[PDB]
From a paper:
Flavin-dependent halogenases (FHals) play an essential role in the regioselective halogenation of natural products such as chloramphenicol, vancomycin, or cryptophycin. Only halide salts, oxygen, and the cofactor FADH2 are required for regioselective halogenation. We were able to show that the gene product forms an active enzyme and catalyses the halogenation of free indole in C3 position. Interestingly, BrvH possesses an intriguing selectivity for bromide over chloride in halogenation that, however, cannot be directly explained from the crystal structure.
The structure of apo BrvH without any bound ligands was determined to a resolution of 2.5 Å. There are two chains in the asymmetric unit with no major differences between the chains. In the crystal, it forms a dimer very similar to that of tryptophan halogenases like PrnA or RebH. BrvH was modelled nearly completely, except for a few terminal residues and residues 46–51, a loop involved in FAD binding that can adopt various conformations in other FHals and is disordered in apo BrvH. The substrate binding site is only partly conserved between BrvH and RebH. There are no equivalent residues in BrvH, as a short loop (residues 432–444) replaces its much longer counterpart in RebH (residues 440–467). As a consequence, the substrate binding site of BrvH is noticeably more open than that of tryptophan halogenases and the ε-amino group of the active site lysine K83 is directly accessible to the solvent. The lack of side chains to keep the amino and carboxy group of tryptophan in place could potentially explain why BrvH does not accept tryptophan as substrate. The openness of the substrate binding site and the absence of large non-polar patches–which would point to a variant B halogenase–resemble the structure of MibH, a tryptophan halogenase that chlorinates tryptophan only when the latter is part of the enzyme’s cognate substrate peptide (deschloro NAI-107). The structure does not contain FAD and there is no halide bound at the assumed halide binding site, the amide nitrogens of T351 and S352 (T359 and G360 in RebH).
Author numbering:
A (entry chain A): 6 to 45, 52 to 502
B (entry chain B): 6 to 44, 52 to 504
Amino acid sequence: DPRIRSVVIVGGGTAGWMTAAALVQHFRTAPLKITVVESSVGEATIPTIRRFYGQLGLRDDDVMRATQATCKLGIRFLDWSGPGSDFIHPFGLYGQDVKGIGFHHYWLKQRRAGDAAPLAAYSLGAALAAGGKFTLPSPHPPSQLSVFDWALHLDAGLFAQHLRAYAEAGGCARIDARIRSVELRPEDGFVRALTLDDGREVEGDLFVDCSGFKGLVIGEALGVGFEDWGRWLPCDAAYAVQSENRPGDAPAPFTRVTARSAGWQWGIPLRHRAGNGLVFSSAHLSDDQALAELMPHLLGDPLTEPRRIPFRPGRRSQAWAKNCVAIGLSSGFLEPLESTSIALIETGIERLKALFPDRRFAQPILDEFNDQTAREMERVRDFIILHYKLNRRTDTDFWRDCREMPVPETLERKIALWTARGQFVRYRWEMFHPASWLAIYDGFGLYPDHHDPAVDAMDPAYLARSLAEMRANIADLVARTPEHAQFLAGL
Amino acid sequence: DPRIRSVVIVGGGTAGWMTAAALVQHFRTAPLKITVVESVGEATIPTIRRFYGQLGLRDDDVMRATQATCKLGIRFLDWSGPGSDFIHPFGLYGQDVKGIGFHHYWLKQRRAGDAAPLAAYSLGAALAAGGKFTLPSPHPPSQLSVFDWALHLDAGLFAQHLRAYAEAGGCARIDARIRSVELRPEDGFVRALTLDDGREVEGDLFVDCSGFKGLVIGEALGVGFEDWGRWLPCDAAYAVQSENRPGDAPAPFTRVTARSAGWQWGIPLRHRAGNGLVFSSAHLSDDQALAELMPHLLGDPLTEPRRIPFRPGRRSQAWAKNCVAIGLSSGFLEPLESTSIALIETGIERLKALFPDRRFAQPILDEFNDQTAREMERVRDFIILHYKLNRRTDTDFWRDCREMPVPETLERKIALWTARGQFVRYRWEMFHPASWLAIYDGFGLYPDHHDPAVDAMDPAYLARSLAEMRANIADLVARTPEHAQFLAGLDP
């Protein structure tokens, strides 16, 4: 029977144990052996992660308790447009669409006629994040204005441990062991087995490489190459360090992303601790200069000294080769500017299930998986690039260069249709939907010349009052919502 | 103010008056002049009910005015050999489970000996086969009760209804032949139309609804044509209206019957029907064509058949300078899957979403041109598939269709379907995965292996869940009124 009989996941962490837990649930009562092989820090996410553990039978409160987690309503971008600049990228839409026309067009008309209200006054998500508030969104919500979503700041290590215990209870084997070698079949070149340090062999029909950046099976064993993207993205290094919260420091329901002289700093709040880091260009900063930016501005008392991490932006040339599928860092890397690492694991897993193979490993299945994965990486790359491309900082060469650097043609087309007409070019496999593009356009102050002319038919007095009603509903709803701290105290 | 001040629509019919009515509603109280300049049974997809929906019109009023009947899908007869019979509905099949598509569970059971057609799990299809009709529920218990519906209608009457709508909102109308198109000297943009009497009709924005010749997009502006006869064999058609015989209840579906070298259509109106044969002249003479068509009409012919040249393909760019082409002026695909009116609708929605100013910014044209091109290609490929998968042995026409090369975009779809039972998704598909499924199943092409999470389920448990679904539909159909009752509530 051509049926896959066994799955061997090479590496634990988030990638390995998310994969194990997801495959355990999906194939719970089927005759499928699943085994992980591994040896004996704060992170952000997007809302997809709540659905991921949702599908496993897990609750938000239980996962949050176990992972030292806090709520994430969006990301806060500080100083990207010059000293004091400040906007929030939320999970939600702005305002209410009318007659099929997007809200932002009516907002632009009114902005043209003198009104100075920020686009963010019409997003409940963003207003809640700025107010240090949190509440669960209503399902079957009164109207479009009250729709927002939310995600987690969490300990990735704890998250990995929680999913491990979940996977093992459903019958996933675990082998604590270093791997000496990967053995290939000499007719096919397919992966036959892993050889452990003690000489045991671990055979499998399907291998998932979660070994990390090195790529032990997809790269070293099978020779799959790497598409380097350093040419598009300047930054090439990072420092990270956990901090301990100081007494009377209420963690905020957002991630802080603060632009510095030659890169940017992150701030990921957990319940009693926080993730901190600086991403930067070594060609503009020494190691001591980097620490001089990072260390005086942490969200708390450092727990250790900073570790350096090499960044190498890009993607594995094919994420699936023969009978190896690469999930997580083994399949590529983009900096955490928009919290996408775990998200790329989630999409990889959903795709593996949607295209799960048999032992013939039919070439069209690999081709489709490889094609989706490639386009999706490129669509996230382009969103990340945009942030640098539209900066308005005058203070260093790093930032001028980012503003004048060439960018992929796919992003040129997006930027060009936005400034010409206020519309969105839509490709396949976008992680980020139109409202997220809008948040970045508006955050960097780039607006179209021409809004949609059906909008100029509306009366400026009538419009002005519909908008003030929206603006007020949000402000007053925010005002009466409890603080983030109260939801955390109930965990 | 760079604002468009005026719009001139060149040609009436469906393309011209759908455009006028849509732009009248969308720009109702704006200072925008709109003018049209001008001098048979058809099918649609459900988008058309939304189109006139957005205008403030009701299904019953439009149906009364257009001699219309209900359309639940299309019925394909004899494409797989004598007696073959399947329906492409507007709906999904069965109930998806645990994120896995219904068709995988159906395939597992089919593997184990059960012979129930995939169509037994579509309410839409079951209602069409049963000669039944009912409005779908607005807030339905589950996926099993969800279907949509469209119209068979008189296109001429539909054009007249929209004309009266457009004129009441302030659209000018000029009855006149056009002598020439005048181009402006710096830009080469269209300045004005010159009429037979010498009047000029000026505009900032021109819409070419002139038909196949392409008076502005083609003749005036020189935009070329991508011919697609290489991919699609048929190159001609005959159409003829028929009068219903007494005691002939029109069916709630379109009939598409394969013949020796092409196919016949049958579009029922309330007291009349559209009929035609699409075919390859390289395999059939004109008299051979009429010998297939004329003995098998849905009634007494109202005239003699007119021939129509078919030339499948698309205008190279649908928008050039300040001319947007809508309808036949932008391209042509045969009505195998009822897409003509649908392509006008998508063109109009796109024009509104990308409505320009007088600078005619190049990125707007480029996006419009790109969307339009891809969408035409996605409809072409769906049409091609129908010929590619035929199982007819009786003529050379049909062997060739089965062995003909097909675009790479379609090769990839067919390859992932047979390998894994999954759908390659491109941008701008008019037809969603369930429609592809209907064609794969109708021509008997199924994957080698279904999704293996499905084999976790017990064959006895599965067999009974499926028989319950199969029965819920059959019993819902059984108690639903006939098509005729809904039509009597529009009529005498």
